Amino acid sequence: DIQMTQTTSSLSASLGDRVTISCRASQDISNHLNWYQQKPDGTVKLLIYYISRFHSGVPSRFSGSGSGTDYSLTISNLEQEDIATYFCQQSKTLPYTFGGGTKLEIKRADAAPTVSIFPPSSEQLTSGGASVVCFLNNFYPKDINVKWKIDGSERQNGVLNSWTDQDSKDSTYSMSSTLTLTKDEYERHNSYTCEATHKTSTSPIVKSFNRNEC
Amino acid sequence: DIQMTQTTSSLSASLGDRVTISCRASQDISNHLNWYQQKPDGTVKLLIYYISRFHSGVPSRFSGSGSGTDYSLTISNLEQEDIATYFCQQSKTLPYTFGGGTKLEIKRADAAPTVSIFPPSSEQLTSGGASVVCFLNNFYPKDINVKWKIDGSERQNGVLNSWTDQDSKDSTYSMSSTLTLTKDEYERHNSYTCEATHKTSTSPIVKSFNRNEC
Amino acid sequence: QVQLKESGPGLVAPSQSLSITCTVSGFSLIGYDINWVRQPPGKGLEWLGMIWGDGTTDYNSALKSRLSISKDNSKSQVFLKMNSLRTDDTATYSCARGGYYYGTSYYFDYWGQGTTLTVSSASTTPPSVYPLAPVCSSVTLGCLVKGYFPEPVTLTWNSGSLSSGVHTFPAVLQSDLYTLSSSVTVTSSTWPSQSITCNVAHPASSTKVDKKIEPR
Amino acid sequence: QVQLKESGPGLVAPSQSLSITCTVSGFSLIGYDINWVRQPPGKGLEWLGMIWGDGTTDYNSALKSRLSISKDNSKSQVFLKMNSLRTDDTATYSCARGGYYYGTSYYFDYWGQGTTLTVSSASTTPPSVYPLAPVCSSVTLGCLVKGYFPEPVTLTWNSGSLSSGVHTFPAVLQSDLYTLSSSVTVTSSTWPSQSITCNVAHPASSTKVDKKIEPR
Amino acid sequence: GEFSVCDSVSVWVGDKTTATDIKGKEVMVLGEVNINNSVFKQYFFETKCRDGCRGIDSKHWNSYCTTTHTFVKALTMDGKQAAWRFIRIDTACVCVLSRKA
Amino acid sequence: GEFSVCDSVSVWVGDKTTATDIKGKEVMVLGEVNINNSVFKQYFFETKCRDSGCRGIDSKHWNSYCTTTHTFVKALTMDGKQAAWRFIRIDTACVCVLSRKA
């Protein structure tokens, strides 16, 4: 087969910058090279075909070039809507192959997260489980740390975190952490705390609740 | 078959004039219509194809149009080199057919003919014949009259005339008249005269010679 | 005025067969190639095969003849069929129309959304859905969707109308079961005065649940 | 650098066969149609047939299958053949290259000069050539070319070098024989001091005569 | 980047019933061809215009986009006689110029 | 009258020995075809460019050049040892392509 390679699969740029996605064919494909954009919403759209040609309804700021077995897509004047994954495809010969893609983060100003904590629902306790949920929403950059506590004592096991993909509109990230316990263990303790540490502060943002205080 | 018709097969215009050669197809040929120029030297040259398209190396002043089954060739700013025959051809369907053509005379100022007369050559008299030749060269317009005389008496029989096609360089016409006799008849007479009448004068231009005066 | 929509089972066990249908509109299958493509979770796209305009086919040899494509032009449908599935066939599957710029170059001008397919011995489990009411400006509410299989679930708020400030977090897999959360931020006057509801679809079990968020 | 040249017998009797060859240069017959065309004296052109690039042929049905075209691509030659000739086949015959503007339209982009063919029972007669010296500014001299058949003859002066002021009049036919005259106008200081000669070719009898013009 | 001067569109054509051959005659194109016990559906690759031209100097030139054609061999029917004939199909969209006035 | 923006040239092609098929593979084109006891020489109608860009282009706001585009036509061919009826790429047109400056 013909391998298509995108060596840098992650890229981070600011609004107005010019970015280059590169692509390498393992054999000569001449001009049979297409470029696609997969937005986070799932949708896929043809940007450029035949190395440099525009598909209808595609911005002036996209641009396609190539030297040898190497091919670049260039986005001048980077706009907020360009958060997507960019991948190439050779249409020279079967089987058609695609590059692994290059994901584009768009930078923005730092933002601390809005933190909210939630005890187990009454419904869940009737079942036998007890999950404690903490949302950390709309922060930048993506790196962040969540520590749990039960009665002022750190709790590391039973903790499952989950990150959204970068928001296309405002460029922020969001993240949920979940502390799962058995009903019995949750009823044996009172204070439950979610503690978020982020580049925006040396002090962590703390949210808490008490079980029997209601 | 598809008949191609050029109803006017003769046309006369002046330098600088705009002339239209027309052509009519007997069925619809859509756009499959070509225009050719046959110069007097014999050569044939494609001017225009597909109603209005130019063959490479063809003047701006040629032009092709058409309505229904009717097709025109237009020569703007008529130049001296345009003395030719112009004919059309349909390339819709076999058999390919041509119009009978339209011959183009280019007008010029009137010119009297240069008249010269020649006795029979000594070689021809040895054979038994005796032709007397008269050239009337470089005149316009084309109509002209030649009368022969033997000893001041009109001679109508044995007279063969011949006309050149219009000269492409200077637009004039030329013409040879020939009085043929038997050797015996020619030796029985002395004065031989060629008499050319033309629009350029009411008096005819006379050229003569005497047989025994040499 | 041109789309492709793929519909498929969502779950199939190893060794069983797979049928996905691509439903096409805005154009005719007599005129255009259809390509099949596949993206395993967190991995690159892979071309599976194509049915040309004239009904002929070509497949990726990697599939070892296990895949076949057929079509019905009148019904505007293309049919993917795969036998002897493995966990390696776990992917999102999409169909895409082929487009030509003369016979000079070839490309995929229109793409379907994609149907998710998980290949596994585990059984379909519907999700339990729990409300997340705040503790004793803007207020944040939530929806825990615990213990389902396979993916995906879709989650809306007030049947789509409450779209702003919604964060549905990717699912996490622990012990063959998926757990997911979603949040929404509304105004403090807006809640609890007007009701806020959590809608959770899970196509694989054909379950659809609504959970109103009520204060303590 | 594109020409076509036709060569043929000039005279053939009724009911005998006709062979003309078109010799082509500046292009390859593998790639281009060749058409045959015919113009009887004082009449319109008539398309006879063609040999396409691929060697196939089509003929004018009016010819009643009497015509055939064949070609040798390596030798750059096209061959017209006609059986059972009649006086109606008296014409100038020309070959012409077909040219295409895409598959959209079609034309004859390059034309051969033409070979003259007379169909008759009469015999080849060579011309007698007679000088025309003036009577006992510019001087006019001449050349009577009497009693030949068939057409044409070509007439030059000083082997072509004396080209200005030349008038070769069209032949006239009386009693199965053609008679033609030519005139040349030159400077007095040119003649009689310097010699003036009349060259007369008649391909059909393969005769070539030169006649110097001498005073009385 | 790079644009067409005239917008074209290419498709497969599998439902062709008629056509005009290279000799100017209107012929019937069969749906199926038979080459050595092999039955192929008769398909055609065609390109044409998408309904002056882009990037033309309109001050000195009138212009428009036009569909041009090619000849491709096909199994056909001239009345009652089946044969392998070249026929005219759409193959391109090209700009053609015209001087004003 | 009327002119091409890009000068094309059309010919018959009767000596084609190789070509690339629609699947991107280099194949051998046979000189002769056999359709029901009927031997036709395999010929192709092709159009391409005739060798400061395209005619009539607004060169102030546009770079341009003339380019040969292609079509697919069915042909009797040879993919190694297996003879088959395949679509192959031949020249079919000359068309102008634009490019914005800077």
PDB file of C-alpha atoms in Angstrom, chain A residues 1 31-32 34 36 38 42-46 49-50 53 55 87 89 91 94-100 114 116-125 127 131 133 135-138 158 160-165 167 170 172-176 178 180 208-210 213-214, chain C residues 35 37 39 43-48 50 52 58-62 100-101 104-113 128-136 139-144 146 165-174 179-185 211-212 216:
ATOM      1  CA  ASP A   1       0.000   0.000   0.000  1.00  0.00           C
ATOM      2  CA  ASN A  31      -1.085  15.301  -7.607  1.00  0.00           C
ATOM      3  CA  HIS A  32      -3.697  12.838  -6.324  1.00  0.00           C
ATOM      4  CA  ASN A  34      -7.011  15.555  -1.022  1.00  0.00           C
ATOM      5  CA  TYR A  36     -10.319  16.952   4.684  1.00  0.00           C
ATOM      6  CA  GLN A  38     -13.233  16.715  10.552  1.00  0.00           C
ATOM      7  CA  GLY A  42     -18.219  14.579  13.820  1.00  0.00           C
ATOM      8  CA  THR A  43     -18.799  16.046  10.357  1.00  0.00           C
ATOM      9  CA  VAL A  44     -16.276  15.653   7.526  1.00  0.00           C
ATOM     10  CA  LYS A  45     -15.794  18.165   4.702  1.00  0.00           C
ATOM     11  CA  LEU A  46     -13.575  18.180   1.595  1.00  0.00           C
ATOM     12  CA  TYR A  49      -8.306  18.215  -3.977  1.00  0.00           C
ATOM     13  CA  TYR A  50      -5.598  17.632  -6.649  1.00  0.00           C
ATOM     14  CA  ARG A  53      -7.750  22.955  -6.086  1.00  0.00           C
ATOM     15  CA  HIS A  55     -13.923  22.471  -3.502  1.00  0.00           C
ATOM     16  CA  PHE A  87      -6.251  14.781   7.302  1.00  0.00           C
ATOM     17  CA  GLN A  89      -5.753  11.162   1.432  1.00  0.00           C
ATOM     18  CA  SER A  91      -6.394   9.015  -4.617  1.00  0.00           C
ATOM     19  CA  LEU A  94      -6.303   1.357  -4.497  1.00  0.00           C
ATOM     20  CA  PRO A  95      -6.461   0.912  -1.639  1.00  0.00           C
ATOM     21  CA  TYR A  96      -7.041   4.605  -0.870  1.00  0.00           C
ATOM     22  CA  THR A  97      -5.214   5.633   2.317  1.00  0.00           C
ATOM     23  CA  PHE A  98      -5.439   8.515   4.778  1.00  0.00           C
ATOM     24  CA  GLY A  99      -2.983  10.218   7.080  1.00  0.00           C
ATOM     25  CA  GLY A 100      -3.615   9.847  10.818  1.00  0.00           C
ATOM     26  CA  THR A 114     -16.174  27.134  37.421  1.00  0.00           C
ATOM     27  CA  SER A 116     -19.517  22.660  41.171  1.00  0.00           C
ATOM     28  CA  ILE A 117     -19.911  19.558  43.401  1.00  0.00           C
ATOM     29  CA  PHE A 118     -22.960  17.252  43.658  1.00  0.00           C
ATOM     30  CA  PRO A 119     -23.757  14.545  46.227  1.00  0.00           C
ATOM     31  CA  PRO A 120     -25.247  11.202  45.117  1.00  0.00           C
ATOM     32  CA  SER A 121     -28.851  11.388  43.961  1.00  0.00           C
ATOM     33  CA  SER A 122     -31.421   9.886  46.335  1.00  0.00           C
ATOM     34  CA  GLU A 123     -32.330   7.471  43.497  1.00  0.00           C
ATOM     35  CA  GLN A 124     -28.765   6.069  43.341  1.00  0.00           C
ATOM     36  CA  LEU A 125     -28.556   5.425  47.089  1.00  0.00           C
ATOM     37  CA  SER A 127     -29.860   1.164  44.301  1.00  0.00           C
ATOM     38  CA  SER A 131     -21.248   8.657  43.067  1.00  0.00           C
ATOM     39  CA  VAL A 133     -19.652  14.403  40.890  1.00  0.00           C
ATOM     40  CA  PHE A 135     -17.670  19.609  37.181  1.00  0.00           C
ATOM     41  CA  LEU A 136     -14.776  21.885  36.303  1.00  0.00           C
ATOM     42  CA  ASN A 137     -16.037  23.935  33.364  1.00  0.00           C
ATOM     43  CA  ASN A 138     -14.625  26.400  30.829  1.00  0.00           C
ATOM     44  CA  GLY A 158     -12.479   5.218  42.840  1.00  0.00           C
ATOM     45  CA  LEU A 160     -12.607   8.606  37.186  1.00  0.00           C
ATOM     46  CA  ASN A 161     -12.052  11.843  35.258  1.00  0.00           C
ATOM     47  CA  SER A 162     -13.213  12.846  31.778  1.00  0.00           C
ATOM     48  CA  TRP A 163     -12.257  15.726  29.454  1.00  0.00           C
ATOM     49  CA  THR A 164     -14.278  17.373  26.696  1.00  0.00           C
ATOM     50  CA  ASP A 165     -12.667  18.248  23.398  1.00  0.00           C
ATOM     51  CA  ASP A 167     -15.000  24.029  22.651  1.00  0.00           C
ATOM     52  CA  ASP A 170     -14.864  29.883  23.100  1.00  0.00           C
ATOM     53  CA  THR A 172     -12.097  26.480  26.608  1.00  0.00           C
ATOM     54  CA  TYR A 173     -11.951  22.938  28.009  1.00  0.00           C
ATOM     55  CA  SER A 174     -14.230  21.223  30.494  1.00  0.00           C
ATOM     56  CA  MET A 175     -13.751  18.221  32.766  1.00  0.00           C
ATOM     57  CA  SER A 176     -15.795  16.026  35.098  1.00  0.00           C
ATOM     58  CA  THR A 178     -16.360  11.313  39.723  1.00  0.00           C
ATOM     59  CA  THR A 180     -17.595   6.347  43.269  1.00  0.00           C
ATOM     60  CA  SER A 208     -17.626  21.137  49.467  1.00  0.00           C
ATOM     61  CA  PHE A 209     -20.800  19.842  51.054  1.00  0.00           C
ATOM     62  CA  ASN A 210     -21.896  18.033  54.183  1.00  0.00           C
ATOM     63  CA  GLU A 213     -26.584  19.214  56.600  1.00  0.00           C
ATOM     64  CA  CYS A 214     -29.938  19.319  54.766  1.00  0.00           C
TER      65      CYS A 214
ATOM     66  CA  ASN C  35     -17.024   4.514  -0.623  1.00  0.00           C
ATOM     67  CA  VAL C  37     -14.600   4.058   5.476  1.00  0.00           C
ATOM     68  CA  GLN C  39     -12.371   4.888  12.149  1.00  0.00           C
ATOM     69  CA  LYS C  43      -7.132   5.885  15.474  1.00  0.00           C
ATOM     70  CA  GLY C  44      -6.828   6.871  11.814  1.00  0.00           C
ATOM     71  CA  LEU C  45      -9.332   6.447   8.996  1.00  0.00           C
ATOM     72  CA  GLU C  46      -9.271   3.323   6.874  1.00  0.00           C
ATOM     73  CA  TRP C  47     -10.838   2.822   3.441  1.00  0.00           C
ATOM     74  CA  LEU C  48     -12.881  -0.409   3.347  1.00  0.00           C
ATOM     75  CA  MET C  50     -16.332   1.062  -2.878  1.00  0.00           C
ATOM     76  CA  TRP C  52     -18.666   2.153  -8.522  1.00  0.00           C
ATOM     77  CA  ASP C  58     -13.254  -3.187  -5.002  1.00  0.00           C
ATOM     78  CA  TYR C  59     -12.252  -4.032  -1.424  1.00  0.00           C
ATOM     79  CA  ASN C  60      -9.261  -3.537   0.823  1.00  0.00           C
ATOM     80  CA  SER C  61      -7.303  -6.796   0.657  1.00  0.00           C
ATOM     81  CA  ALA C  62      -6.620  -6.450   4.423  1.00  0.00           C
ATOM     82  CA  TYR C 100     -14.387  13.529 -10.032  1.00  0.00           C
ATOM     83  CA  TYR C 101     -12.653  16.571 -11.466  1.00  0.00           C
ATOM     84  CA  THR C 104      -7.817  13.832 -13.814  1.00  0.00           C
ATOM     85  CA  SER C 105      -8.445  13.541 -10.053  1.00  0.00           C
ATOM     86  CA  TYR C 106     -10.785  11.805  -7.576  1.00  0.00           C
ATOM     87  CA  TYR C 107     -12.046  12.714  -4.099  1.00  0.00           C
ATOM     88  CA  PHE C 108     -14.800  12.223  -1.485  1.00  0.00           C
ATOM     89  CA  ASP C 109     -17.074  15.268  -1.713  1.00  0.00           C
ATOM     90  CA  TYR C 110     -19.882  14.254   0.703  1.00  0.00           C
ATOM     91  CA  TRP C 111     -19.695  12.271   3.914  1.00  0.00           C
ATOM     92  CA  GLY C 112     -22.241  10.627   6.144  1.00  0.00           C
ATOM     93  CA  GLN C 113     -22.232  11.257   9.895  1.00  0.00           C
ATOM     94  CA  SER C 128     -29.673   4.297  34.898  1.00  0.00           C
ATOM     95  CA  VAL C 129     -30.195   8.072  34.872  1.00  0.00           C
ATOM     96  CA  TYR C 130     -29.737  10.174  38.004  1.00  0.00           C
ATOM     97  CA  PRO C 131     -30.321  13.901  38.628  1.00  0.00           C
ATOM     98  CA  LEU C 132     -27.586  16.146  40.033  1.00  0.00           C
ATOM     99  CA  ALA C 133     -29.148  18.849  42.188  1.00  0.00           C
ATOM    100  CA  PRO C 134     -26.849  21.441  43.805  1.00  0.00           C
ATOM    101  CA  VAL C 135     -25.776  21.685  47.447  1.00  0.00           C
ATOM    102  CA  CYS C 136     -27.733  22.912  50.477  1.00  0.00           C
ATOM    103  CA  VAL C 139     -26.523  27.795  38.562  1.00  0.00           C
ATOM    104  CA  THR C 140     -25.062  24.514  37.288  1.00  0.00           C
ATOM    105  CA  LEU C 141     -27.192  21.350  37.129  1.00  0.00           C
ATOM    106  CA  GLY C 142     -26.435  17.806  35.990  1.00  0.00           C
ATOM    107  CA  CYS C 143     -27.233  14.317  34.791  1.00  0.00           C
ATOM    108  CA  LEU C 144     -25.316  11.160  35.676  1.00  0.00           C
ATOM    109  CA  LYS C 146     -24.446   5.221  34.708  1.00  0.00           C
ATOM    110  CA  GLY C 165     -23.703  26.124  28.285  1.00  0.00           C
ATOM    111  CA  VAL C 166     -24.124  22.384  27.837  1.00  0.00           C
ATOM    112  CA  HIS C 167     -21.200  20.031  28.431  1.00  0.00           C
ATOM    113  CA  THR C 168     -21.632  16.343  27.784  1.00  0.00           C
ATOM    114  CA  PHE C 169     -18.451  14.600  28.841  1.00  0.00           C
ATOM    115  CA  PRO C 170     -17.097  11.580  26.953  1.00  0.00           C
ATOM    116  CA  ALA C 171     -18.012   8.245  28.541  1.00  0.00           C
ATOM    117  CA  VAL C 172     -15.679   6.220  30.711  1.00  0.00           C
ATOM    118  CA  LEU C 173     -15.513   2.408  30.610  1.00  0.00           C
ATOM    119  CA  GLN C 174     -15.099   0.468  33.857  1.00  0.00           C
ATOM    120  CA  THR C 179     -20.682   6.023  32.689  1.00  0.00           C
ATOM    121  CA  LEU C 180     -21.188   9.557  31.445  1.00  0.00           C
ATOM    122  CA  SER C 181     -22.121  12.946  32.862  1.00  0.00           C
ATOM    123  CA  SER C 182     -23.661  16.090  31.409  1.00  0.00           C
ATOM    124  CA  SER C 183     -23.958  19.600  32.795  1.00  0.00           C
ATOM    125  CA  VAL C 184     -26.045  22.669  32.004  1.00  0.00           C
ATOM    126  CA  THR C 185     -25.801  26.226  33.299  1.00  0.00           C
ATOM    127  CA  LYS C 211     -35.152  13.038  34.439  1.00  0.00           C
ATOM    128  CA  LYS C 212     -36.390  16.288  35.968  1.00  0.00           C
ATOM    129  CA  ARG C 216     -33.467  19.082  48.058  1.00  0.00           C
TER     130      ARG C 216
END
